[PDB]
Every structure is written in structure tokens, then in C-alpha cells.
Design a protein around this ligand. Structure first.
Ligand SMILES: [Zn+2]
Lengths: 210, 208, 317, 169, 221, 431
């Protein structure tokens, strides 16, 4: 399964795959960084990090670019944050090759209370320990160091958690650009495909070394 | 230190006290702890990273004509902890993380096998084996990402043939529990020498 | 046909949310007054940003601070330049770990530099001044935090051009750090954001370009200093906004872990920063207020940009 | 002689819990209504999970904005259970959320962590007779998403009571 | 909007430490009856001023005094905002609320000079109006502060007479969620009492009661 | 006056380095730069594409710590450094040759700047020594019992290997190059390799050169009855048992290294400059090496604190003396660093002492031998690029009514307030 107009780009050795779309003058770019530690099962039931990706919706008629922090769970899609950047999709805006996008900008309000609903389930969060310097030993990594992760808001929980009726309109607004649940079912299945091919290539390289 | 000219007499006299009792104590050693054989220890005076370096020659069978020499490199970053979360958060456990590079025969992150180990409670805990550069599989798999490179799975979940072959590869390289004890000893001496330099550099800043 | 009614429903809701946001903070017609900074502080907040920088210059050293000047009536040294970088990073650790009794943890960094003027005569050449940008450019980087409106020190770092030269040239055996050299190889400038001036009221109309003049006074004096080509390495070292500057300051010492210091040094360091240097609990509580106010100001521009995007789609489709 | 106090090197964080007598708390058996699994008994685990997902969360008591309690009546009118909700596939959840439930995109986002983890809807025993404790462990497909621990084996609706008896219901 | 988290440091006690230091103790406060539906000065926090409440004149009394006025029953408008008044209540005089505490301090000649109408005698009937009856209630309290024996209030004056939908715009001062309150920032009390006052049992939107003492219930177990 | 011109000119150069920056690959992106660098190289026997790839490699190995965008004045300084490398600095005859320096390296390119080095070479080789005392250190140990046996030397702050070449030309056995940057040491090693390939400084006696990277001064001299014989036997059995017994004790790296003490110990910080070069002329393609004349003058050695720590190390476990008995320390330094402070005291502030006064009053044990102030820094004054640069700086930023007096304020500053002092001192033996 694959969405309608999306080209995949995945080179072996990097835990990243990037999806690109273009309709009219608008360009849609989906970037994902697959976790190396452990990712959750596609059935969901039974350290189990969620599949978090980003979606860049560029519209030159508006003059702004929409960055959508999205989390794919059970094939479906939730959207955690939406931020706006100036101009079109510059190459520096995408966190490929471990160089981040724009720094020191407003991240956006909470569109959904998914992170507060996980603590009722007692699901383990991204923040492992309270000490930020404890998790800064594995620096420049989003999954084990949340204090410098762009997708986890650099550990900051914002003031405003957006109104449900307002932000339901924002999630419907992004679904017309290809940020529907059909993309998140593919990103969930392709992150499990990258996690097997990265672990198999790392093993067979390690066999020839020793 | 006249109090009319210098309003910071509570700090400048306290830091002059802390210079002497950090030098008048007899528990400290003037000499660095002696490293194991081959290892050369570099440390820049301003930073908190000290480097180890040795050359090595493996055991090569008689069917092969030549044994290529290796390049072992140790990289240790000093551990940071946040005192603002105390006494609320618990006491963070003292552990000594370090990196062990292996390069066959010129930098640190080109054609190098990198293995990360943790010395905690008197033993080594090997965490990840990170590759850098183009390696052979079985095709060529390139790991050209130095910050967000694929570090491999954690060895608690890895396959059993990967584990015992790695520890036989690590015990042959003389990386074991006695080597990690020296990294726990050398980083204490490095942090002690940085602290007396930090007290010396702070007295020049406050009194100015 | 569905793209027009979706983009018009969002643009009407964002206009309804921006309308309902202003009337909440408005009291009897006049809008919400921002919290006032302490005496002498000049806050600059760039538009569309996550941070705000405030400066303070104590002339003739520490003795002209606020606490050292109040006395009972009716009965020289080098100048100090303060800089408090404050990002919007505020969280509570009692959600992830319920054993920790912390309601609010807000991090903000303090950069204090010193500058020798030409008017001091008493102690000019008795020793080489290490705080001078001509001699080392020694500067103290105090990482601070606010734990339930109580200022706690995270780290005290002493950074000069020496350890900026050490990281770029000889941090390894014969080379620099391979990640610090690569992070300087990818340094693109940010687009110019128009800053807003939430200054102290008494210094709001006296001088406007004073934090810009002291930022270019040191940048001229450090780039043409005894250490010339290592100033781009020192700019990224003292850059408080981003992850490249946090990794660069982590390659340095990072200070002693403060709870292991003596109790006499812990109270004398707090007496220096709060009492002598002026970076007080009033300033610490103001930063927690100004991180809340300017987050509210950035939510309204976010609501203005949802409406601006949704109106540009509906007029196109 | 000075005897040392017997401690442990590695202790689980559950042992750090507080009891006013520093002892094991009482586990009272559930009421007689839970003896047979029926239509009155089926959806009490679904009701408490939707009650916790809408109430206040954390030490700061963060109120959940989306009220998931309004969808409890239409879920039990269809005859679907919390244990039967975990058996639905991905395609059967999009049909259930959009057509029947009319779950909005933020109400779907607050319910999905409860479905992603496959929480076992087993009423745990407690010190009182009326129990509001549901086992929050992640379920496995071999034991019917019941997490297979403390006697929750593939039909156990309530701790201390009989199985489901699917021939009746 | 959008559910702003508040910068107060109130917190519920954890699951590890024992409950200690019982010379302050928060519990949940639930009164008997709801008071939010009532008039603003008929609520719970204004019960001590219950005898200060002016007697009510109603709509039919106001229409009867419109048709058949009396020479010494003074109808007085207490509305302050001139941009929000559009019609004239008949036989009314303008005495805005925020000046009333000065206006009754004048003499009769100074009242005539500063308002253009004669000062009412202390035995004359005074009837006050406002938009909702709130400014008129505070003005009636100021009129009863001076020795005025007959002071009456028409609750919902303009909004029931002219059928308008206005309000006196009372702020009812509530701290902004960036303003951190007193007991978090301060060393006014010891650390145990500071930790035990700042704790609460449940969500922080409801009301709580602070106990100054507690004894253990030894007779349960 | 000159002080405001100093401040405004350095602020303008900082704004030039901040504002008009161009991308990294200037040959690929900028379409005008290639013909410009070809014009600068065809102004003074190489092909065009070879010069293109050579400047690409020069910007690759030369530019450090720079992002995707490079300052334009830095690109012009890179062009001047490339021109100075492919052209070389000429050292006059007494020994006239050419030297090839790297990008940011200090070489005295004017004769007034080379006169203290030429006079020190004259005092070393004893060509025509008309000064107070002539030096003799270990050749006096042979004459008590000549120049053919040589001596060992120490070089503090070696830049591009010109002073190491001056030590090799005057006759020396072991010289130890100590500098802060390894780039300067690689440049000095290339200069030493071309010096050995030039067949100067003939090899009747063997000479080994070691370049070490360190701070101001290196420190490597601190490594750490029958019971003594029993402990030696137990030590031998433990070394043979734990396989730490050395099978060979030649140690050729310990022979080819340079080890103290030294009888000639020299120290020369780079001369600080009054005004940087003007990078905005119309004839930049005619002379770019003079635009790179200021290269190398920003080094971590030219300070008063470095001089004070150097003098305190020379004055005082006490195992390493670091200087031979009655050894000669030769230092070439200006009157004072930080020329802004020199302009501040010109016509108030108290009079600033000279570094000669500091070196005299700190070392009461050492006796001065040569004290010569080369005050011919005003004697440069040609029609060359430095006079055009200072007239452009006085033409752009100074009012026309206050110009020429400020020009006079320049002309006395090089005459009275700046000079190059070469001073040699001699150690006094122990009692
Ligand atoms: Zn269970």
C-alpha cells in the first residue's frame, strides 16, 4: 500500500525516509526519523517508542510553510503541533543529515491532549529521568535525548492547549493536503521496514568485522 | 580587600579559603594515575574531555601474509548533573561513560568502529556499537552520519551470536573490567584538576 | 469544492479564537499590561521567536547595584555587563515522575562579562586583567533555573577564548573536536526578526540602541583581539539559542556539581548573584512571568497565521 | 553486636509505595453482581476507562478537555465491549469512529493511547467493596489482550470471579 | 482561551511520603445550596451585608411613579458610563455612582452647584437605578452610610424598563495566570507549613477549607 | 583625533566581516571571482585551471571554523595569502632568499621590521659585532680545554619557520619549535623541508629538528643495605613476569627529540598593527600580498600576561632549569602591546611603562648584554600600499578640516611611540 503521489527516498545506513508530494504550486514533504532503540508493534499490544514524523506543507500563495508534528499510532494519525515558517521549503528547514531546521521559533500550542492521556495508561514517556544532563550524554538524538528533540518541543509543554472544536478544523484542513490517516498507515509500516533492514545490515557488517 | 572598594568580600575571602584547603589536603595525588601499557593520555586544560590513544597489532593466522596495525582511541566526556533538581530528585548514580574507537591502517569518524561502554558499580556495561564510514556487509553500507548515525540495537535485545562474538572481540582488545576502573580513576583526577583551575579562574573574574 | 468550505471554516474559527483571546485579557477596554522588568533591565523579544534577551550594565562595577546603594538617610573597577537569555522551556517533572515535588521548572541562562574602561587609575597595571577582551575575554556563564519560584543554580562555567581555541585546534591529540568542527561548518544565519522592546519604564525612552552598542563593543574588541581567528568559534560557544551552543558549552568543564560544594561557597555564590550581581529572585520571578506573557503574545500571532493561511487557500481554490 | 538493616540493591518502584501501617493492604473480594458476566456487567470496565480519560490528570490535576463519557451510551447500545474494542482491526475502527461514534479528531487522539496499549479491562480488587481500579497493563494477543498476569487469562472480566462464558454472552 | 495552565504551585500529595504536619490541613469545601443563580449581593460572600441590602422597588412601582409622581420621592439614576445610556427614565436625576461618596458630603448649596438639582432630605424617599442593579446597590450602600432613612433599589433598572441588554461591567478581580500569588514567593512561614498550605486535595477549580488543627481519630482503630 | 578614527575603522572592518558575506564555494556560485583571481595571478608560469584548483585547495585547508557563507574581506585575505604563498617573502643578503608562508602566519615583509632579525643574525654569526659583549656558551667549553660544534636552541612562538631558519643559518644543533597552532608548525616544517632541499646550512655536523605543539613554554621533564638489591631483584622478576621488560633500550625517538637545557632561548611575539589594510581600493588586482601584510599579527602570545608567565618561568621541585648555565635569552618585542592604549596616552592617564622596563626590573639575576631599540618603524613611509591604506582610512572617515593634523598624529606615533626592541640577557651561575 502507498498513497497516490508520494515518492520514497531511503538509503541504507541512515534511519530516515522522506516522502515528497507536489500538487499545483504547493509542495508536501514528510520526513521521518526511525528509532533505533525499540518501536511499538503494529498490533500495539505488547523501550516501545512511538513512530513520530514531521510533515511540511508549503503553500507559496500564502507565503508560509506549515510544519506538522504528527504521531502515527495503530496506523491512524494524530497531530501534536503546527508551526509556521517564512517562505517556501528551504533545504535547511528539514532535519535531514542531523542538521536541524530553524531554531528559536514559536513551536505552537497543544492541539490534542495525547501526552496527558498516556499517563493515565501509565505508558512510559519520552522523558526517562528528571535530570536533563543525564539524558544529554546521547546528544543529537531525538528518541533518547528529548531535551534537544525538535519533535518533542525540547521538553517544553506549552501554555495553551487548543480548543477541540477549533483544532478539529485544523486537522481537517491538513487532511486535504495528504496528511490523512492513509499516509500514517504507510509511515507506520515503512518505519517497521527500515528498522528491520537497518538491524540486518548492522548485524552482517558486524559479522565480517569479527 | 577594602570593603569600600570591594563589595564582594564574602566571596573573595571564601574562594581564597577554598584554594588552600583544596591544596593543603593530603588525600589528593600530584601525579596522574598510571595508565595501562601503550595508552597515552591527552587532555586540553580548558575542556572536560580527555583522550586515550594506543597502537595495536591483532592475532593473524598463518594463511594471511600481513597483520595490519590498528588504532585504539579512548574518548571520555565528563558526567554532568543538575543540582537544581535536588533535594527533590534522587541522587544521580556515579557512572563513567566513554567511547572506544578502532581504526585499521585520518580522523575519529572515518572508517572507524565505535563502541560505547558504561563503567558502573565496578563493571563495564557495553551499550552500542556505532559504525562510521563505508563498511562491507555479508554490498557496501555507508554510515556517514556522525551525530544521528544508526547506533545499532541495544545489546539486551540483540542476538546471541552477536553478543559472544563481540565480547571475544572485546576481551582480545584488552577492554574489560580492570580497564574501566582506570577510566573511573583518571576522570576523577581530571575533574579534580579542572576544579582547582575553575577556582583559580573564578577569583580572577570576581576580583576584577 | 470541499477545499473552499474547509478553509473558510478554519479561517472563521481562527478569527473567532483570536477575538475570544483578546477579550479574556482585556480589562475595561485597556489591554493586558506586560509584567515590569526590574531596574535597569532592557528586554528585547523578537517577533515569532521562542526567547527574549534582557541586558543590564552596572557602571563602576558591583558597588552601583540596587542592593548596595539603598541606605538609611535623614539622620575604580571595571564595568559589569549582564545578559539573561530566557527561552520558553518550562515544564513540570511531577508528571513523568510523581515522586518529585516540583510544580514548575524553568531554565534560563545568565551571561556576565566585564569591560575595563579608560577612567580607572588605581589598579591599572598591577596585574593583567583577565576579564578584558584583549586578554582572554573571560566570561561567566551561569545556567540558572526556577524551581517553584525559587532560583537554583544549574552550572557556573568560565569561558574564555582559550578553550574556544582549544576546541577548534587541539581538543584531540593533534586536531580539534570532530563534532565541534563540523557544527561550525554548518552555521547559517537566521532571518532578521523585528524585536519588541519591553524595557524597564525608566530606561524605555532614554536610550534605545544601548544593548546593541554593548554587543558590538565587545564583538569589535574580541574579533580584533589577541585571539583573532577563534572568535567565530567563540560566537558559537556563547550562542545561547539552539543545540549547537549547548553541545559546545558541554565540551568545556561545566563547573563543579554545586550540591557537592561547601555550604560556605554555596551561600557566597548566591550572595554574589542575587545581592551583588543583581540577578535576583525578583528577576527570577519576572522571567517566569515574561515566559508566560510572551507565550500568550505568540499564541495570538499563531492564531493570526492560521487565519492568514486559511484565507489564502479559500480565495485560491 | 550491631545488626545491619536488610535492604536490597535492586528494588522495584512499586515497593516505594506508602501504607499507613507499612504493611500489605487488604484486598476485598468484589460484590455479588460481578459473579456472572452479563450485559449489566460487561461495560463497567469501559465506563471507568472513559471516566479516567476525561477527568483530571496528574499531580497538578490537568483537566482533560475532551469528554469521552458522552460516547459511552452509544458504545454499549451497539453491544460492543472494551475487550471487544481491542479485538477490532484498524479498518473496523475507522468504521466505528466515523460512522457510529462520530469521534472528532481530538477525541480520537485522547482515546487512542488506551487502544494502542491494549489496556486489560479487568477490575482489580481493592480495600473497599466498590472498586474503581482497572489493570493498566498492556495486553497480549495470546491471552486475549488481558496481559496474562495475576490471573487475567483470556476471559477474566473481574479479578476473583469466573470467566466470560461466551456461549451465553 | 485554549485552557491556559495557571502559574500557581498548588499540588496534590504523592503516593510515597506519609501525611504529616497536621496543624494545617486542606479539605474539600462544599456548601449546602448553590448561590451562582442569585443576585450578586445576595450570594454567600455578601451575607454579612444582608441587613444593608436596600428594599426593592419593582417594575409596577416604577411605572406607577412614571405615571403619578410624588414631589419628594426622588428617582435617581446611578449609571456612570455616558456612552451606554440612550434613554431617559422619567422624573430621574443623574447622580453617577463613582461620585456618590463625595456627593453626599456636600452641603445643599454645594450639591445644587455641583449637580444642578437640590439635595434630597434625609426623610425623603430615594429610589436608585442602574443597568443590572449593581451600581445602584453600591450607591444605596453609600446612601445608607449617610443617615438616609428611606433608600430603595430597582434591581435591573434600565434593562427591564427600556428592555436593553447591558451591564455595569464589574471586573471581580481575578489574578492573571502569569501573576504568581503570595505564598509561593516568600519566607513568611516555615517550610513545613509552607508545603502544607500550598497542598490541596483534588482539582484547583473548587473551594477548599483550611484546618488549623487536627487530632487523630483513635476510636476508629 | 586618531582614537575615534581607530574605533570607527575597526567597527567598520567588523561590519565588513559581518554584512557582505558570500557563500562557501565561491568558484562555483560567484561568476565574477574566477576571472578576478586569474587577474590577480596574471598580474605578477602556471596554467589557469591549476591556479583554480590550487585556490580551491587553499581555501579548503586554510579556512577553519567557517560555515556555508564566507566574509568577502576574508576571501580577499585568502587571495592575498595565496599570492604571498606562491610569491614568497624575500629575506635580504648579509643570505637573501625567498620563503613561502601559509595563510595566517607572521613574517616581517618590510626591511624596517627585519632589521632587528638581521642585527640578531649578525650578533649570532659574529659577522661584524660592534656591540657590548659577544656571546659564547658551549664553544667556550671547547676553547677552555668553535663554531663547528654548534649549540642547542629554543624557539618560542615560531611562525612560518623564519626564525628556525635563522637559527639553522647561524649554526645550531637542536632547535625546538614551540607554537600554539599546529597550522603554523606544519608551515614551519614545510619551510624546514625546503631549507634542507636548498642545500644551505651545510651538514658537516648532524642537526635534528623537533617541532612540538604546546603553550608558551613546554613542560615534559617530569615523568613521575641488601634490601635495595632485593627490591631490584623483585622488580626485575616482576618486570619479566608481567612482560613489561623492554627487549630493546635504544629509544631513537628519545635521541632525535630536543631536550633541555638550552643556551640560546629566544622569544618573539608578532608586532601589533595600528590600522588594518584597506580592502576597498580600485587596484586590488595589482597588489594583494600587501593586503595580506597584516596576516599573523593576531596570535595568543602577544600579551603582557604571556610575557609575565614567560619571565616567571625563566626566573623560577626545580629539576628542569630550562636554560643552560650563563645561557642567553633573546627576545624581540615592541614598546607595548595594545596600541589603543598607546593612542589613549597621546595628547590625563599615567605614563605606561615599556616592556623593556618589565624585563629589566623582573630579572635582577640576569644581566643585559644587548639593548637596541629599532625605532625605524616610522622609516617605512614609502609610496607603497600601507601609506595608501592609511591615507584611504584618513580620507574616508575623517572630516576635511581635521585631516592633516591627524595625519601628523600618525607620523609621530610611529616615530616616538612605537619601536622594535631586541634585547638579549645572560644567566648568572649558582653559588
Ligand atoms: Zn491485567
Amino acid at each position: 500500500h502507498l498513497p497516490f503521489n508520494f515518492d520514497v527516498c531511503y538509503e541504507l545506513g541512515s534511519r530516515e525516509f522522506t516522502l515528497f508530494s507536489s500538487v499545483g504550486s504547493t509542495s508536501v514533504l514528510v520526513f521521518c526519523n526511525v528509532s533505533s532503540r525499540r518501536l511499538r508493534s503494529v498490533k500495539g499490544g505488547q523501550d516501545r517508542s512511538p513512530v513520530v514524523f514531521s510533515a511540511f506543507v508549503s503553500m507559496p500563495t500564502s507565503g508560509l510553510t506549515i510544519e506538522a508534528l504528527c504521531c502515527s499510532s495503530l496506523g491512524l494519525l494524530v497531530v501534536d503541533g503546527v508551526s509556521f515558517h517564512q517562505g517556501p521549503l528551504t533545504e535547511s528547514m528539514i532535519p535531514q543529515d542531523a542538521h536541524p531546521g530553524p531554531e528559536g521559533h514559536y513551536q505552537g500550542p497543544l492541539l490534542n491532549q495525547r501526552s496527558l492521556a498516556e499517563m493515565v495508561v501509565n505508558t512510559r514517556g519520552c522523558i526517562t529521568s528528571v535530570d536533563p544532563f543525564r539524558q544529554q550524554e546521547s546528544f543529537f538524538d531525538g528518541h533518547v535525548n528529548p531535551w534537544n528533540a525538535r519533535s518533542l518541543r525540547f521538553g517544553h509543554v506549552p501554555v495553551h492547549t487548543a480548543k477541540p472544536g477549533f483544532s478539529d478544523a485544523l486537522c481537517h484542513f491538513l487532511e486535504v493536503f495528504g496528511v490523512n490517516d492513509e499516509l500514517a498507515f504507510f509511515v507506520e509500516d515503512f518505519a517497521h521496514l527500515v528498522h528491520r533492514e537497518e538491524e540486518t545490515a548492522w548485524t552482517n557488517v558486524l559479522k565480517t568485522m569479527m | 580587600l577594602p570593603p569600600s572598594d570591594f563589595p564582594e568580600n564574602a566571596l573573595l575571602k571564601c574562594i581564597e579559603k577554598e584554594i588552600e584547603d583544596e591544596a593543603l589536603r593530603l588525600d589528593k595525588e600530584e601525579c596522574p594515575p598510571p595508565p595501562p601499557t601503550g595508552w597515552e593520555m591527552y587532555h586540553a586544560p580548558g575542556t572536560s574531555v580527555f583522550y586515550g590513544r594506543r597502537w595495536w597489532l591483532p592475532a593473524t593466522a598463518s594463511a594471511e601474509t600481513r597483520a595490519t596495525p590498528e588504532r585504539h582511541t579512548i574518548r571520555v566526556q565528563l558526567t554532568k548533573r543538575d543540582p537544581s533538581l535536588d533535594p527533590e530528585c534522587d541522587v544521580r548514580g556515579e557512572h563513567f561513560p566513554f567511547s572506544f574507537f578502532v581504526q585499521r591502517a585520518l580522523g575519529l569518524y572515518d572508517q572507524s568502529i565505535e563502541v560505547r561502554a558504561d563503567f558502573v558499580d565496578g563493571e563495564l556495561l557495553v551499550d552500542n556499537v556505532v559504525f562510521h564510514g563505508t563498511f562491507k556487509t555479508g554490498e557496501e553500507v555507508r554510515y556517514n552520519n556522525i551525530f544521528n548515525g544508526y547506533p545499532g540495537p541495544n545489546l539486551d535485545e540483540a542476538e546471541e551470536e552477536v553478543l559472544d562474538g563481540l565480547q571475544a572481540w572485546l576481551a582480545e582488545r584488552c577492554v574489560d573490567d580492570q580497564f574501566g576502573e582506570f577510566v573511573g580513576q583518571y576522570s576523577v583526577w581530571v575533574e579534580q584538576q579542572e576544579y582547582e583551575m575553575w577556582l583559580k579562574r573564578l577569583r580572577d573574574f570576581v576580583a576584577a | 469544492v470541499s477545499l473552499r468550505t474547509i478553509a473558510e471554516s478554519l479561517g472563521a474559527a481562527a478569527a473567532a479564537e483570536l477575538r475570544a483571546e483578546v477579550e479574556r485579557d482585556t480589562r475595561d477596554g485597556v489591554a493586558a499590561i506586560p509584567p515590569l522588568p526590574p531596574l535597569g533591565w532592557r528586554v528585547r523579544h523578537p517577533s515569532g521567536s521562542n526567547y527574549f534577551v534582557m541586558t543590564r550594565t552596572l557602571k563602576n562595577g558591583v558597588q552601583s547595584a540596587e542592593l548596595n546603594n539603598r541606605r538609611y538617610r535623614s539622620v575604580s573597577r571595571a564595568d559589569v555587563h549582564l545578559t539573561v537569555f530566557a527561552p520558553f522551556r518550562v515544564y513540570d517533572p511531577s508528571l513523568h515522575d510523581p515522586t518529585v515535588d516540583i510544580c514548575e521548572w524553568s531554565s534560563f541562562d545568565l551571561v556576565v562579562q566585564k569591560t575595563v574602561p579608560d577612567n580607572m587609575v588605581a589598579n591599572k597595571l598591577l596585574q593583567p586583567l583577565s576579564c578584558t577582551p584583549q586578554d582572554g575575554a573571560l566570561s561567566m556563564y551561569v545556567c540558572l533555573a526556577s524551581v517553584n519560584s525559587e532560583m537554583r543554580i544549574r552550572s557556573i562555567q568560565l569561558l574564555s577564548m582559550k578553550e574556544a581555541q582549544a576546541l577548534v585546534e587541539h581538543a584531540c591529540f593533534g586536531n580539534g573536536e570532530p563534532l565541534f568542527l563540523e557544527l561550525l561548518r554548518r552555521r547559517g544565519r537566521r532571518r532578521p526578526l523585528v524585536e519588541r522592546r519591553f524595557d524597564d519604564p525608566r530606561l524605555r525612552y532614554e536610550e534605545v540602541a544601548q544593548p546593541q552598542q554593548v554587543a558590538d563593543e565587545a564583538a569589535v574588541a574580541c574579533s580584533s583581539s589577541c585571539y583573532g581567528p577563534y572568535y567565530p568559534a567563540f560566537e558559537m560557544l556563547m550562542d545561547s539559542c539552539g543545540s549547537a551552543g549547548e553541545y559546545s558549552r558541554a565540551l568545556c568543564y561545566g563547573g563543579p556539581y554545586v550540591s557537592e560544594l561547601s555550604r560556605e561557597l554555596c551561600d557566597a555564590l548566591l550572595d554574589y548573584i542575587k545581592g551583588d550581581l543583581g540577578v535576583s529572585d525578583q528577576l527570577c520571578e519576572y522571567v517566569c512571568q515574561m515566559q508566560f506573557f510572551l507565550e500568550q503574545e505568540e499564541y495570538m500571532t499563531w492564531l493570526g497565521q492560521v487565519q492568514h493561511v486559511a484565507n489564502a487557500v479559500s480565495r485560491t481554490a | 553486636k550491631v545488626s545491619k538493616v536488610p535492604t536490597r540493591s535492586v528494588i522495584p518502584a512499586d515497593a516505594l509505595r506508602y501504607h499507613p501501617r507499612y504493611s500489605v493492604p487488604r484486598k476485598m473480594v468484589l460484590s455479588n453482581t460481578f459473579n456472572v458476566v452479563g450485559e449489566n456487567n460487561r461495560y463497567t470496565s469501559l465506563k471507568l476507562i472513559l471516566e479516567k480519560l476525561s477527568g483530571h490528570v496528574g499531580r497538578r490535576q490537568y483537566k482533560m478537555l475532551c469528554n469521552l463519557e458522552k460516547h459511552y451510551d452509544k458504545l454499549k447500545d451497539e453491544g460492543i465491549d472494551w475487550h471487544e474494542l481491542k479485538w477490532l482491526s484498524r479498518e473496523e475502527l475507522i468504521v466505528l469512529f466515523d460512522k457510529v461514534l462520530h469521534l472528532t479528531r481530538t477525541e480520537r487522539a485522547a482515546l487512542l493511547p488506551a487502544i494502542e496499549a491494549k489496556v486489560c479491562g479487568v477490575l482489580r480488587q481493592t480495600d473497599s467493596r466498590h472498586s474503581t481500579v482497572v489493570c493498566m497493563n498492556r495486553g497480549n494477543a495470546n491471552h486475549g489482550w488481558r496481559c496474562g498476569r495475576n490471573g487475567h487469562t483470556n476471559d477474566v472480566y473481574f479479578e476473583g470471579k469466573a470467566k466470560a462464558n461466551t456461549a451465553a454472552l | 482561551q485554549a485552557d491556559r495552565r495557571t502559574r500557581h504551585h498548588m499540588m496534590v500529595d504523592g503516593q510515597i511520603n506519609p501525611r504529616e504536619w497536621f496543624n494545617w490541613h486542606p479539605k474539600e469545601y462544599q456548601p449546602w445550596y448553590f448561590d451562582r443563580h442569585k443576585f450578586l449581593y445576595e450570594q454567600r460572600q455578601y451575607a454579612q451585608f444582608h441587613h444593608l441590602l436596600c428594599h426593592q422597588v419593582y417594575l409596577k412601582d416604577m411605572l406607577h411613579l412614571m405615571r403619578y409622581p410624588e414631589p419628594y420621592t426622588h428617582i435617581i439614576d446611578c449609571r456612570t458610563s455616558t456612552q451606554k445610556m440612550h434613554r431617559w427614565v422619567p422624573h430621574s436625576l443623574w447622580l453617577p455612582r463613582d461620585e456618590v461618596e463625595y456627593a453626599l458630603q456636600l452641603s445643599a448649596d454645594e450639591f445644587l452647584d455641583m449637580y444642578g438639582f437640590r439635595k434630597p432630605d434625609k426623610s425623603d424617599d430615594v429610589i436608585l437605578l442602574s443597568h443590572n442593579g449593581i451600581y445602584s446597590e453600591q450607591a444605596g450602600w453609600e446612601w445608607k452610610k449617610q443617615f438616609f432613612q428611606h433608600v430603595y433599589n430597582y434591581r435591573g433598572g434600565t434593562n427591564e424598563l427600556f428592555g436593553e441588554s447591558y451591564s455595569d461591567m464589574n471586573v471581580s478581580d481575578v489574578l492573571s495566570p502569569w501573576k504568581g500569588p503570595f505564598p509561593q514567593s516568600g519566607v513568611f512561614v516555615d517550610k513545613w507549613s509552607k508545603r502544607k498550605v500550598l497542598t490541596r486535595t483534588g482539582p484547583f477549580d473548587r473551594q477548599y477549607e483550611m484546618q488549623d488543627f487536627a487530632l487523630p481519630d483513635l476510636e476508629l482503630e | 583625533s586618531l582614537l575615534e578614527l581607530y574605533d570607527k575603522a575597526y567597527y567598520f572592518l567588523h561590519l565588513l566581516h559581518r554584512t557582505i558575506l558570500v557563500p562557501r564555494n565561491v568558484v562555483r556560485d560567484t561568476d565574477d571571482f574566477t576571472e578576478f583571481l586569474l587577474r590577480c595571478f596574471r598580474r605578477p608560469q602556471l596554467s589557469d585551471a591549476a591556479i583554480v584548483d590550487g585556490f580551491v585547495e587553499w581555501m579548503e585547508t586554510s579556512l577553519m571554523s567557517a560555515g556555508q557563507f564566507v566574509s568577502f574581506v576574508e576571501v580577499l585575505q585568502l587571495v592575498g595569502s595565496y599570492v604571498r604563498y606562491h610569491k614568497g617573502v624575500r629575506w635580504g643578503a648579509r643570505c637573501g632568499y625567498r620563503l613561502h608562508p601559509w595563510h595566517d602566519t607572521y613574517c616581517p615583509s618590510s626591511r624596517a621590521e627585519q632589521m632587528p632579525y638581521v642585527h640578531l643574525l649578525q650578533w649570532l654569526m659574529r659577522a661584524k659585532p660592534t656591540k657590548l659583549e659577544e656571546k659564547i656558551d658551549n664553544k667556550e667549553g671547547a676553547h677552555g680545554a668553535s663554531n663547528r660544534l654548534g649549540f642547542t636552541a629554543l624557539d618560542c612562538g615560531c611562525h612560518s619557520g623564519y626564525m628556525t631558519e635563522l637559527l639553522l643559518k647561524a649554526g645550531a644543533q637542536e632547535v625546538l619549535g614551540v607554537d600554539v597552532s599546529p597550522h603554523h608548525l606544519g608551515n614551519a616544517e614545510a619551510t624546514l623541508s625546503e631549507h634542507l632541499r636548498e642545500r644551505r646550512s651545510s651538514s658537516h655536523s648532524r642537526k635534528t629538528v623537533q617541532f612540538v605543539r604546546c603553550d608558551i613554554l613546554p613542560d615534559l621533564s617530569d615523568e613521575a643495605e641488601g634490601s635495595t638489591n632485593s627490591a631490584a631483584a623483585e622488580n626485575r622478576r616482576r618486570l619479566a613476569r608481567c612482560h613489561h621488560m623492554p627487549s630493546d633500550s635504544d629509544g631513537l625517538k628519545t635521541e632525535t627529540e630536543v631536550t633541555g637545557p638550552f643556551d640560546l632561548l629566544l622569544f618573539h611575539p608578532p608586532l601589533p598593527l595600528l590600522f588594518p589594510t584597506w580592502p576597498l581600493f580600485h587596484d586590488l588586482y595589482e597588489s594583494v600580498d600587501q593586503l595580506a601584510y597584516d596576516a599573523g599579527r593576531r596570535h595568543p602570545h602577544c600579551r603582557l600576561s604571556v610575557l609575565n608567565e614567560f619571565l616567571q618561568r625563566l626566573l623560577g621541585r626545580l629539576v628542569a632549569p630550562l636554560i643552560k648555565d650563563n645561557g642567553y635569552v633573546a627576545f624581540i618585542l615592541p614598546r607595548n602591546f595594545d596600541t589603543r592604549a598607546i593612542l589613549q596616552r597621546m595628547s590625563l592617564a599615567p605614563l605606561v611603562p615599556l616592556s623593556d622596563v618589565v624585563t629589566m626590573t623582573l630579572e635582577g639575576s640576569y644581566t643585559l648584554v644587548l639593548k637596541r631599540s629599532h625605532s625605524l618603524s616610522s622609516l617605512l613611509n614609502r609610496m607603497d600600499y600601507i601609506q595608501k591604506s592609511i591615507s584611504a582610512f584618513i580620507r574616508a572617515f575623517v572630516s576635511p578640516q581635521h585631516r592633516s593634523r591627524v595625519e601628523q598624529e600618525v607620523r609621530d606615533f610611529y616615530s616616538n611611540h612605537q619601536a622594535i626592541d631586541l634585547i638579549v640577557m645572560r644567566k648568572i651561575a649558582r653559588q
